[PDB]
DNA sequence: CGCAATAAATGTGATCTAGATCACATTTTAGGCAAAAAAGGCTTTACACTTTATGCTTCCGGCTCGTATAATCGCACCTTATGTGAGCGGATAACAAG
DNA sequence: CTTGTTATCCGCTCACAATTCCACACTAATTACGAGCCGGAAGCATAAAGTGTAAAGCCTTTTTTGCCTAAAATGTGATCTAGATCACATTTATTGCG
């Protein structure tokens, strides 16, 4: 199958928690550069192509978890906010 | 008039970049034009254009705007005028 | 058949497909509920909006 | 159509559901050839040009 | 952003003034020569805006320079051509016009505050010339009418002065001049004095309707529209198509009209005309008025040249030209692809091919992203240029570019969740989509030229749940059930089949050492399993070779081929699996058991290997197909030799002329339709003995294969009936009509059929392609009413705050009488601490789930109610806890939060609907079912015991019966039944009670030919107007010689023989009738025709004499149905087209016949008071018998029961019990298997509805939710003390009427009846907010459910990995 | 002090190029300075732009008026025949109460 | 006997079609005309102040060209010491082992 997936249903009592927790922030990841993710570059994905490794992907950030933190609405209010991203030529 | 996806991009980057590689040319062609509509408004005043750059008379008003004209060939991958038609 | 991008209307403003171009897949209803079933999200206001 | 020969015999998962494979020899010969045709026309207008 | 709620009001005149700028009165459109719009016309720019950007029609202002300044010649702003869509107009009516949305949509608003009542008034006076009054003299009526004839009489004397008035001018003037204060106090003290029903009927809406415009910021004198906007330019375009040629809408024809239609009536009619044709012109404003609002109403409205039904504006709106349920819901997606299916053994479980060209066409915007980023490509606009259309396209990075972006197959239909999957894109040379060949069970197709579509995801959000729930791997378990829906199929299954394969038919055991040694025969413990023993299992096979392995620290003796695959299960995960022939329903277990414990994963990894082993033995099998393959059974003329014997004796009988052609006609298929099934099975029997791998067939392609045993035993493809068109025999045909060929055709392929025993053969095909024409149609229609209702039902929560008191305790007395099963019990965790008998330490834990096996430790010895946490037990406010439910079924734990149950219940039981829907036809007049059991006999040992029987001695000299509820059961030891059995009436026994009986004895024998009637009491005997040759006459027997006086029915009497109706009454010593104790209804034993009788006029008969005797026949529609009808009856909860009449009162069960049928009260209770009666018809089938304590609320007959009946009685705990299971019954007997906790939460929506019956000081119509039986009902004395008690009755309503009566108007909006609500929201104003489901599509934006929920929105996991904690 | 064994270090000396010398006569090198050929400079004169007042003419364009006219009326012939159930108000017949 | 409300019935207006993609091919009838009228524009040349274009008329500044020749860089080859070169034969010194 895949790497590192069932073992995420498993060490949690939920599924659909786990959505959310490698949707509406890796999602963000992109919008917001690359940054943001202080985490070492140990933790991400590996694509075989050309001799080398690209992309990101993610479902191997998820270790520390936590109940009550922010809303909702500001998780994308602020974000923009502070980086504003665009696309630029020479 | 309502552009699709497909060239929604393309037209956006022909009408915001020729401004940028604009100031890298002789001032004094360049700066007549471009100070003159692009900052301000209305062009072509003749006995008034005389008096904005403070130097030759009103036979430069239309010898600088032809000369620059052939100059706007430069931006290739930057383009702004080409475009209203 | 493939279809990427297309023309579109102008008060119905949806996909459509002419000659050259090819026609894009409606997606019908039926496999609306089927998706609602999982319990998703942004998977499907995507089918609906952009 | 026309007859050809045959080995009656599955092949390895290939053949799974109404699948089959055609031994090249038989495009060799181009035994199976269509001619499909269409229809192509241009027509000259009287424009205001 | 986003949307929250929605506010809706009333629209003034004084609000549109605001939008519009100006008035139309121009019909005129625009002009086709400069194509400039006309002046002040429809399509005008001083009003509507420009038609350029940035530039008005005449040409005073051209170029950019003017951002934004309006003209002094033109009049018109300076603006772009988007803001044509938005602004409007409108139109000064001189003559006032009610609206269309207000004056037919029940209750009036314009009719009803004025007095009004709804139609025999707000009409009539519309039409011709109806003068009624608006104001009044001196205390007048408000309601009735004038004259003509009567109103020219009505002006000089004999009247006063009296406000005339003609139609729609008069129902404005009226809003304006009424106080809404004093009128609603005025109506409000008339619901008492008068009868409610000459007035309080329709006072009923007056109250109501006026309280919504005081809350409200509202006012009547709005409903009236002096004014119409108009509907933009950009919805109404007018662009030329082709040839100089143009283009507009119908609907501007509804504008040049009104204009002529207003202009009229003001300088010609209101000033000149008499009064006998103004008004009918006053009657064509309206009806032009109200068609263009909505059109199809009333007076559907015509376009000049080609007629066709005029569109107008609600019309197009809506949709209302469909009925609505047609809607235009479906949005093209704009990245999709197609192509034809193939299949490829390359490809995983978890991987799919697909087309190579079709890679760059899906992925087109994202491959020109990373082709900028790498080094083929620096901008996107160059790379447009060179995969255009040429011999320049070269592969590069579409390989990396698709590598985790899994795409969602779509095969339609789809009717669960599997038929749209996820798998990881592989790239693959060709023009086709290659499918893996075990998920084939999921899309249910064949690759003979199928097609199915591909989706490709373009969000990230959507890219991780495509790997969370949309993916194949962990959806393995079915929902329904849970048994794993993905096996092996023909080849995966055969390789299998093959390696794992003796030989059985051993001897017995011994010794053994030398000389057998037979290949891999199958034994208990000989042959080389002894003499070659190996440690290792590496060295074994090679030359073929079997003994002696080791596994899970045991000694057994098995071949290489029976421990090949049962030595990779211990790899990950060690089981035992016992000895047996490995198939397709034997790895169904074994992959159930290996999601229990473990994950996803290692049990995903077990499907790896089964299908690399699955097609390489299948490769050597060397299977083919000669001449002599096709032998043919030697049982074959074993079978036919019997038949032949009755042939030879069926035309013996017809020359004679003893036996009609009918009669011959139905029993030569009750011999043939059993010969064709017997040989099939004693071909099989040989298969399996001294050889198996015998291969038959033909050479064909399809989905079977060689060896015609190999395959039908391994469970891939081959049913005995097919297979008997090989080796056995044709079978039977049928006519067209519904009759069966007489000659059978036995003559097989083999030797060939004859010309006309072919020509039968063509008959019985036509019945192939006729009976699923129906099914392959729309099964989802059951599914199509669960949604749209149950689209609510989700856990909101994971605990409520119930105790364990209050909740459901399923009874094991359920079902048609009494039928439970483990199923209700299947995952639930208990509430209360049930104490169950036996040691200590025994009691179940008050907190714990319930396991399959747990349940069996339940119902076993407890039998009695056990309290448990159900769905329709919550206490919470829309949404069902993650308690309350149980098990997931579609994994193996308990339920997340998340599980939108109420949607995925509804394909759980709609998608087996395309296996139900069986006979419905006829063949020649079904009157009833099927039966058999003659004698009963016991087969163990005991002593036969009977419960409450009455058996005397009986004139005629047998051992018959007085009552109708004993029972033959066998005592054990312990006092249980082992067995049960039942007797029919009038029947007698050998033995009586206390005998005992041994093994294989018959206790039992009655004469199932004929139902003798019993008295119940004494008496004598009394004909009752019988004379013989006159109503009665005897009738001797041609078989049994016996001569009795048979009675013949009413139909066949006389003139006066009619009026007398046949009867044996039975007196005291007086003469008096009998009266029967409780019942109270007269003894007399009537005798329908086809009875006969044996006994004489004056005799003494005790009770259990037989009277007389009625052979019964055969009657009651069927009630065994199943499929859609059947489901979309108890739901909709509709009255069943199976009555079954319920008494109301309990008590004791009395039985009283009739000579018209039975009478009674279906089974009258007795009580204590006084009983009841009625009627209904014999087309009854009887179920319970005499003895039986049945309150109300109790099916008594059979099949379905009135939802709204047992509602009186039952309540809630108990009505929903039985729909639930009713349905859980028609699923039973098909075969499939689905929990009723899918029906618990669709059923507890018809829970939230409660009408009141005792009102004091309320109106009738309240009715809520049903949580608040903690003040409702207690607001009587201890609540509020109000001294005002009002009792409450439940109300389950209909499923689709459910959703109807919802707080939302946007949601019964969606469904049936949108027209209503969108008025009833408005004067009151509703704020209705985002919590439903489909009031979410519509609008556009994240679903309140499922992923995202309250309760879930909470917790996330951001913060910005450590940046954003101290932003909050 | 002697012994072991895989790597690094040793000599040979005739053969055949590789790298170096010199002082003076020839041949190359560098940037230098006007002239010619080219860039834009900043003049002063040759002409050409659409524009806009106008009014006069013919041709094509777009709009109405009144007049003249008969009528305010009449057969025989060709081919089909919507679908239902659910929801609703109104008209009629059967019923109990006065 | 007469009256009322109520239940059942009918015809009526009323609200109300949902399995899912694509390809090929094809398609429209009718208001009386003629003479007289005012309308727009056919694009005509006109003419002016105003404007922006388009010849090339000597100035000044840049840039390639050919130029001169003062001073520095460049072969002549036969002889001669300090340098280099190979292969793979045999001899040498390194740290330990025993």
């Known amino acids: 199958a895949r790497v590192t997936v069932q073992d995420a249903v498993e060490k949690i009592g939920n599924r659909f928690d786990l959505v959310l927790v490698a949707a509406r922030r890796a999602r963000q990841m992109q919008v917001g550069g690359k940054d943001p993710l202080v985490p070492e570059e140990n933790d991400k994905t590996t694509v075989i192509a050309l001799r080398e490794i690209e992309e990101g992907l993610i479902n191997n950030q998820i270790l520390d978890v936590r109940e009550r933190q922010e809303q909702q609405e500001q998780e994308a209010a602020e974000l923009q906010a502070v980086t504003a991203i665009a696309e630029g030529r020479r | 008039t309502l552009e699709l996806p497909l060239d929604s991009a393309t037209t956006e980057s022909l009408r915001a970049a020729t401004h940028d590689v604009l100031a890298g040319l002789t001032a004094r062609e360049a700066k007549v034009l471009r100070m003159r509509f692009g900052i301000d408004m209305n062009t072509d005043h003749t006995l008034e254009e005389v008096g904005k750059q403070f130097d030759v008379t009103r036979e430069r008003i239309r010898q600088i705007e032809a000369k620059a004209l052939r100059k706007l060939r430069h931006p290739s991958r930057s383009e702004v005028l080409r475009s209203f038609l | 058949h493939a279809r990427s991008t297309g023309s579109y209307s102008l008060v119905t403003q949806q996909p459509l497909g002419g000659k050259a171009q090819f026609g894009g897949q409606r997606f019908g209803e039926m496999e609306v509920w089927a998706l609602e079933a999982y319990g998703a999200a942004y998977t499907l206001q995507e089918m609906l909006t952009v | 159509g026309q007859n050809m020969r045959v080995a009656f015999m599955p092949w390895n998962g290939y053949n799974f559901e109404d699948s089959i494979l055609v031994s090249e020899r038989v495009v060799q010969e181009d035994r199976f050839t269509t001619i499909h045709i269409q229809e192509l026309a241009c027509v000259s207008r009287d424009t205001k040009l | 952003?986003?949307?929250?709620?929605?506010?809706?009001?009333?629209?003034?005149?004084?609000?549109?003034?605001?939008?519009?700028?100006?008035?139309?009165?121009?019909?005129?459109?625009?002009?086709?020569?400069?194509?400039?719009?006309?002046?002040?016309?429809?399509?005008?720019?001083?009003?509507?805006?420009?038609?350029?950007?940035?530039?008005?029609?005449?040409?005073?202002?051209?170029?950019?320079?003017?951002?934004?300044?309006?003209?002094?010649?033109?009049?018109?702003?300076?603006?772009?051509?988007?803001?044509?869509?938005?602004?409007?107009?409108?139109?000064?009516?001189?003559?006032?016009?009610?609206?269309?949305?207000?004056?037919?949509?029940?209750?009036?608003?314009?009719?009803?505050?004025?007095?009004?009542?709804?139609?025999?008034?707000?009409?009539?006076?519309?039409?011709?010339?109806?003068?009624?009054?608006?104001?009044?003299?001196?205390?007048?009526?408000?309601?009735?009418?004038?004259?003509?004839?009567?109103?020219?009489?009505?002006?000089?004397?004999?009247?006063?002065?009296?406000?005339?008035?003609?139609?729609?001018?008069?129902i404005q003037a009226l809003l304006k001049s009424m106080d809404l204060e004093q009128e609603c106090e005025q109506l409000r003290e008339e619901l008492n004095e008068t009868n409610s029903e000459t007035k309080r009927k329709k006072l009923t809406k007056r109250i109501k309707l006026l309280e919504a415009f005081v809350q409200s910021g509202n006012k009547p004198e709005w409903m009236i529209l002096t004014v119409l906007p108009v509907l933009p330019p950009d919805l109404r375009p007018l662009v030329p198509l082709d040839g100089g040629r143009f283009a507009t809408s119908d609907l501007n024809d509804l504008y040049r009209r009104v204009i002529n239609r207003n202009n009229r009536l003001k300088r010609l009619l209101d000033l000149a005309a008499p009064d006998i044709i103004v008004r009918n012109e006053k009657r064509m404003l309206q009806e032009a008025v109200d068609a263009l609002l909505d059109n199809g109403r009333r007076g559907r409205a015509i376009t000049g040249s080609n007629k066709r039904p005029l569109k107008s504006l609600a019309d197009m709106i809506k949709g209302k030209q469909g009925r609505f349920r047609q809607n235009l819901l479906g949005k093209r997606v704009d990245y999709s692809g197609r192509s034809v299916i193939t299949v490829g053994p390359y490809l995983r479980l978890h991987q799919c091919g697909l087309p190579k060209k079709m890679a760059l066409e899906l992925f087109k915007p994202f491959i020109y992203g990373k082709l900028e980023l790498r080094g083929l490509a620096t901008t996107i606009k160059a790379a447009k240029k060179m995969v255009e259309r040429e011999e320049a396209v070269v592969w590069d990075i579409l390989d990396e570019v698709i590598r985790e972006?899994?795409?969602?197959?779509?095969?339609?239909?789809?009717?669960?969740?599997?038929?749209?999957?996820?798998?990881?894109?592989?790239?693959?040379?060709?023009?086709?989509?290659?499918?893996?060949?075990?998920?084939?069970?999921?899309?249910?197709?064949?690759?003979?030229?199928?097609?199915?579509?591909?989706?490709?995801?373009?969000?990230?959000?959507?890219?991780?749940?495509?790997?969370?729930?949309?993916?194949?791997?962990?959806?393995?378990?079915?929902?329904?059930?849970?048994?794993?829906?993905?096996?092996?199929?023909?080849?995966?299954?055969?390789?299998?089949?093959?390696?794992?394969?003796?030989?059985?038919?051993?001897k017995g055991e011994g010794m053994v050492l030398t000389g057998p040694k037979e290949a891999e025969r199958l034994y208990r413990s000989g042959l080389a399993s002894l003499h070659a023993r190996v440690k290792v299992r590496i060295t074994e096979y090679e030359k073929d070779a079997n003994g002696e392995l080791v596994a899970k620290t045991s000694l057994k003796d098995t071949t290489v081929g029976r421990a090949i695959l049962w030595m990779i299960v211990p790899k990950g995960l060690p089981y035992s699996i016992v000895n047996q022939a490995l198939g397709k329903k034997a790895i169904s277990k074994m992959l159930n058991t290996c999601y229990r414990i473990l994950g996803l994963k290692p049990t995903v990894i077990f499907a790896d290997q089964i299908m690399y082993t699955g097609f390489a033995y299948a490769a050597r099998s060397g299977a083919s197909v000669g001449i002599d393959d096709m032998v043919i059974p030697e049982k074959k003329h074993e079978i036919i030799s019997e038949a032949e014997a009755e042939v030879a004796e069926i035309q013996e009988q017809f020359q004679s002329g003893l036996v009609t052609a009918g009669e011959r006609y139905n029993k030569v298929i009750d011999i043939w339709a059993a010969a064709n099934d017997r040989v099939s099975k004693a071909?099989?029997?040989?298969?399996?003995?001294?050889?198996?791998?015998?291969?038959?067939?033909?050479?064909?392609?399809?989905?079977?294969?060689?060896?015609?045993?190999?395959?039908?035993?391994?469970?891939?493809?081959?049913?005995?009936?097919?297979?008997?068109?090989?080796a056995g025999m044709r079978g039977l045909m049928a006519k067209p009509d519904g009759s069966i060929i007489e000659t059978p055709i036995t003559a097989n392929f083999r030797e060939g059929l004859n010309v006309l025993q072919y020509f039968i053969s063509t008959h019985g095909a036509r019945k192939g392609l006729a009976d699923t024409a129906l099914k392959t149609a729309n099964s989802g229609y059951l599914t199509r009413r669960l949604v749209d209702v149950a689209q609510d039902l989700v856990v909101t929560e994971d605990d409520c705050g119930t105790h364990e008191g209050i909740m459901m305790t399923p009874v094991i007395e359920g079902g048609d009488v009494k039928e439970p099963l483990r199923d209700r019990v299947l995952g639930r965790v208990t509430a209360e601490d049930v104490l169950k008998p036996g040691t200590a330490d025994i009691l179940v834990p008050r907190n714990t789930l319930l396991h399959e096996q747990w349940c069996d430790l339940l119902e076993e010895n407890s039998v009695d109610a056990v309290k448990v946490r159900?769905?329709?037990?919550?206490?919470?406010?829309?949404?069902?806890?993650?308690?309350?439910?149980?098990?997931?079924?579609?994994?193996?734990?308990?339920?997340?939060?998340?599980?939108?149950?109420?949607?995925?219940?509804?394909?759980?039981?709609?998608?087996?609907?395309?296996?139900?829907?069986?006979?419905?036809?006829?063949?020649?007049?079904?009157?009833?079912?099927?039966?058999?059991?003659?004698?009963?006999?016991?087969?163990?040992?005991?002593?036969?015991?009977?419960?409450?029987?009455?058996?005397?001695?009986?004139?005629?000299?047998?051992?018959?019966?007085?009552?109708?509820?004993?029972?033959?059961?066998?005592?054990?030891?312990?006092?249980?039944?082992?067995?049960?059995?039942?007797?029919?009436?009038?029947?007698?026994?050998?033995?009586?009670?206390?005998?005992?009986?041994?093994?294989?004895?018959?206790?039992?024998?009655?004469?199932?030919?004929?139902?003798?009637?019993?008295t119940e009491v004494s008496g004598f005997v009394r004909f009752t107007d019988m004379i013989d040759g006159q109503t009665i006459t005897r009738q001797t027997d041609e078989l049994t010689g016996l001569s009795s006086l048979v009675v013949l029915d009413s139909a066949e009497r006389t003139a006066g023989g009619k009026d007398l109706r046949?009867?044996?009454?039975?007196?005291?010593?007086?003469?008096?009738?009998?009266?029967?104790?409780?019942?109270?209804?007269?003894?007399?034993?009537?005798?329908?025709?086809?009875?006969?009788?044996?006994?004489?006029?004056?005799?003494?008969?005790?009770?259990?004499?037989?009277?007389?005797?009625?052979?019964?026949?055969?009657?009651?529609?069927?009630?065994?149905?199943?499929?859609?009808?059947?489901?979309?009856?108890?739901?909709?909860?509709?009255?069943?087209?199976?009555?079954?009449?319920?008494?109301?009162?309990?008590?004791?069960?009395?039985?009283?016949?009739?000579?018209?049928?039975?009478?009674?009260?279906?089974?009258?209770?007795?009580?204590?008071?006084?009983?009841?009666?009625?009627?209904i018809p014999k087309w009854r089938q009887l179920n319970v018998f005499e003895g039986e304590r049945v309150e109300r609320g109790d099916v008594i007959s059979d099949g379905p029961e009135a939802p709204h009946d047992i509602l009186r009685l039952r309540g809630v705990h108990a009505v929903t019990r039985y729909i639930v299971n009713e349905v859980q019954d028609v699923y039973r007997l098909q075969g499939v298997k689905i929990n009723d906790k899918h029906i618990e939460v669709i059923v507890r929506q018809m829970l939230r509805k409660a009408t009141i019956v005792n009102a004091g000081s309320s109106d009738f119509l309240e009715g809520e939710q049903v949580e608040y039986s903690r003040v409702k009902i207690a607001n009587r004395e201890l609540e509020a003390n109000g001294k005002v008690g009002a009792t409450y009755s439940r109300d389950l309503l209909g499923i689709t009427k459910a959703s109807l009566a919802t707080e939302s108007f946007i949601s019964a909006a969606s469904f049936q009846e949108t027209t209503r609500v969108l008025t009833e929201a408005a004067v009151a104003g509703k704020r209705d907010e985002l919590r439903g489901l489909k009031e979410n599509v519509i609008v556009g934006r994240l679903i309140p459910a499922g992923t995202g929920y309250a309760y879930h929105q909470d917790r996330m996991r951001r913060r910005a990995a450590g940046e954003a904690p101290a932003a909050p």
Not at chain 5, 142 to 148: A, C, G, H, N, Y
Not at chain 5, 871 to 889: E, I, P
Request: charged content about 25%.
């Open chain 5, 1 to 170: 952003e986003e949307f929250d709620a929605i506010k809706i009001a009333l629209a003034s005149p004084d609000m549109i003034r605001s939008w519009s700028f100006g008035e139309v009165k121009k019909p005129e459109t625009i002009n086709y020569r400069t194509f400039k719009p006309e002046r002040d016309g429809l399509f005008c720019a001083r009003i509507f805006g420009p038609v350029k950007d940035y530039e008005c029609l005449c040409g005073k202002y051209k170029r950019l320079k003017h951002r934004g300044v309006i003209c002094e010649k033109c009049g018109v702003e300076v603006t772009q051509t988007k803001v044509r869509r938005e602004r409007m107009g409108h139109i000064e009516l001189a003559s006032p016009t009610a609206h269309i949305w207000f004056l037919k949509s029940l209750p009036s608003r314009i009719g009803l505050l004025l007095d009004m009542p709804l139609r025999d008034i707000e009409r009539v006076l519309y039409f011709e010339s109806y003068v009624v009054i608006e104001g009044g003299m001196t205390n007048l009526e408000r309601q009735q009418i004038l004259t003509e004839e009567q109103y020219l009489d009505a002006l000089e004397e004999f009247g006063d002065e009296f406000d005339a008035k003609m139609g729609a001018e008069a």
């Open chain 5, 405 to 506: 972006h899994p795409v969602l197959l779509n095969r339609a239909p789809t009717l669960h969740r599997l038929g749209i999957q996820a798998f990881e894109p592989v790239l693959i040379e060709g023009k086709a989509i290659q499918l893996h060949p075990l998920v084939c069970a999921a899309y249910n197709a064949d690759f003979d030229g199928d097609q199915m579509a591909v989706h490709v995801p373009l969000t990230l959000e959507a890219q991780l749940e495509a790997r969370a729930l949309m993916m194949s791997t962990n959806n393995i378990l079915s929902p329904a059930n849970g048994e794993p829906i993905i096996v092996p199929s023909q080849d995966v299954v055969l390789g299998l089949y093959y390696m794992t394969r003796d030989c059985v038919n051993a």
């Open chain 5, 683 to 726: 071909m099989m029997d040989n298969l399996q003995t001294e050889t198996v791998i015998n291969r038959d067939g033909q050479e064909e392609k399809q989905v079977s294969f060689n060896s015609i045993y190999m395959m039908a035993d391994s469970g891939a493809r081959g049913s005995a009936a097919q297979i008997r068109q090989l």
């Open chain 5, 870 to 1014: 159900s769905v329709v037990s919550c206490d919470t406010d829309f949404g069902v806890c993650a308690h309350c439910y149980g098990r997931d079924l579609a994994r193996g734990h308990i339920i997340n939060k998340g599980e939108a149950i109420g949607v995925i219940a509804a394909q759980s039981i709609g998608e087996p609907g395309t296996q139900l829907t069986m006979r419905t036809f006829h063949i020649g007049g079904a009157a009833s079912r099927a039966a058999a059991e003659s004698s009963i006999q016991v087969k163990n040992k005991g002593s036969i015991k009977l419960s409450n029987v009455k058996s005397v001695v009986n004139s005629s000299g047998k051992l018959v019966i007085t009552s109708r509820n004993t029972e033959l059961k066998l005592i054990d030891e312990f006092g249980r039944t082992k067995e049960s059995y039942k007797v029919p009436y009038g029947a007698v026994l050998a033995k009586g009670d206390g005998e005992q009986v041994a093994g294989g004895e018959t206790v039992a024998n009655w004469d199932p030919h004929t139902m003798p009637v019993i």
């Open chain 5, 1062 to 1175: 046949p009867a044996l009454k039975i007196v005291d010593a007086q003469g008096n009738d009998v009266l029967i104790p409780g019942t109270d209804m007269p003894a007399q034993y009537f005798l329908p025709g086809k009875a006969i009788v044996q006994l004489e006029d004056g005799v003494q008969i005790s009770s259990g004499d037989t009277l007389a005797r009625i052979p019964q026949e055969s009657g009651g529609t069927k009630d065994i149905t199943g499929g859609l009808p059947r489901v979309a009856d108890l739901f909709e909860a509709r009255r069943p087209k199976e009555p079954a009449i319920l008494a109301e009162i309990s008590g004791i069960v009395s039985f009283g016949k009739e000579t018209k049928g039975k009478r009674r009260l279906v089974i009258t209770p007795v009580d204590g008071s006084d009983p009841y009666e009625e009627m």
